[PDB]
UniProtKB/Swiss-Prot annotation:
Residues that hold Ca(2+) 1 according to the record: P175, V177, D200
Catalytic EC class: hydrolase
GO aspect biological process, one term: proteolysis
Name the UniProt record assigns to this protein: Proteinase K
Co-factor: note: Binds 2 calcium ions per subunit.
Parent sequence residues shown: 106 to 384 of 384
Binding site for Ca(2+) 2: T16, D260
Length: 279
């Protein structure tokens, strides 16, 4: 399949070169997979989700996304126009309030929730979780992410937006999950993107158009935006039978565009998420 005039990040993920504008992908499009978006929620009523999104959990007085950032991330995973995996099922877990903040104990509860909740969902092709969040180093936060991964979920987490070594942030610093840095449309490391040995992969993160609340759309930037490209890619690859939750991060790294990003500090992977789709 070909989507013309796609957001640059989608075009990038299906290309051996920057500077193109068509997204190419297998028509299966993540059908039969599921992606949990652990964030501020998802506006499931957005036409872009086509009924494939649902809120499954909140820790607050509402499950509504009163912020937008969860909706944006979910859009990059699986919206019809702005998404990588256009036929995946999206499940929202609201661990962040409408200011985009969340206590680590709530975030941890959300991760353990997903590990159980997948057993209540139909995801024959596999399960992914996208965590566009983080804070300072916490062994408990890392351990929760590790459990989620161990339970059979492909966990993709943001590296962070500190232009610093991600070793000092959680869940970014958890070795067993897929830690995602951000790049721009010119294949530069995004200026805010964290880096370091703990990174596994880069995805498009600067000036990413996606869904927003009130049935709208929005371009924003962050490792928060790169993460759902990788989460959506994992779901897409799992539907194709190319990989599984336990090795999707490895598979993505092994099939990535290599050595093509600029301003990657010595010791950080130079790997850009790539679907290796041949039309
Ligand atoms: Ca790893």
């Amino acid at each position: 399949a070909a989507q013309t005039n796609a957001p640059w990040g989608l075009a990038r993920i299906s290309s051996t070169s920057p500077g193109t504008s068509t997204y190419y992908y297998d028509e299966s499009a993540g059908q039969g997979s599921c992606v949990y978006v652990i964030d501020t929620g998802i506006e499931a009523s957005h036409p872009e989700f086509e009924g494939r999104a649902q809120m499954v959990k909140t820790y607050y007085y509402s499950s509504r996304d009163g912020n937008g950032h969860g909706t944006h991330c979910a859009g990059t995973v699986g919206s019809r126009t702005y998404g990588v995996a256009k036929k995946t099922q999206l499940f929202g877990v609201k661990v962040l309030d409408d200011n985009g903040s969340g206590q680590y104990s709530t975030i941890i509860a959300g991760m353990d929730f997903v590990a159980s909740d997948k057993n209540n969902r139909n995801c024959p092709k596999g399960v992914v979780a996208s965590l566009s969040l983080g804070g300072g180093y916490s062994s408990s936060v890392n351990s929760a992410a590790a459990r989620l991964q161990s339970s059979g979920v492909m966990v993709a987490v943001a590296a962070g937006n500190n232009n610093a070594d991600a070793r000092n942030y959680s869940p970014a610093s958890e070795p067993s999950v897929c830690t995602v840095g951000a790049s721009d449309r010119y294949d530069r490391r995004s200026s805010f993107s964290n880096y370091g040995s703990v990174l596994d992969i880069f995805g498009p993160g600067t000036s990413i158009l996606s869904t927003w609340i009130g049935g709208s759309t929005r371009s924003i930037s962050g490792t928060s935006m790169a993460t759902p490209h990788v989460a959506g890619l994992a779901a897409y690859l799992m539907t194709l039978g190319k990989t599984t939750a336990a090795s999707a991060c490895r598979y993505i790294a092994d099939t990535a565009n290599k050595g093509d990003l600029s301003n990657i500090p010595f010791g950080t992977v130079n790997l850009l998420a790539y679907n290796n789709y041949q039309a």
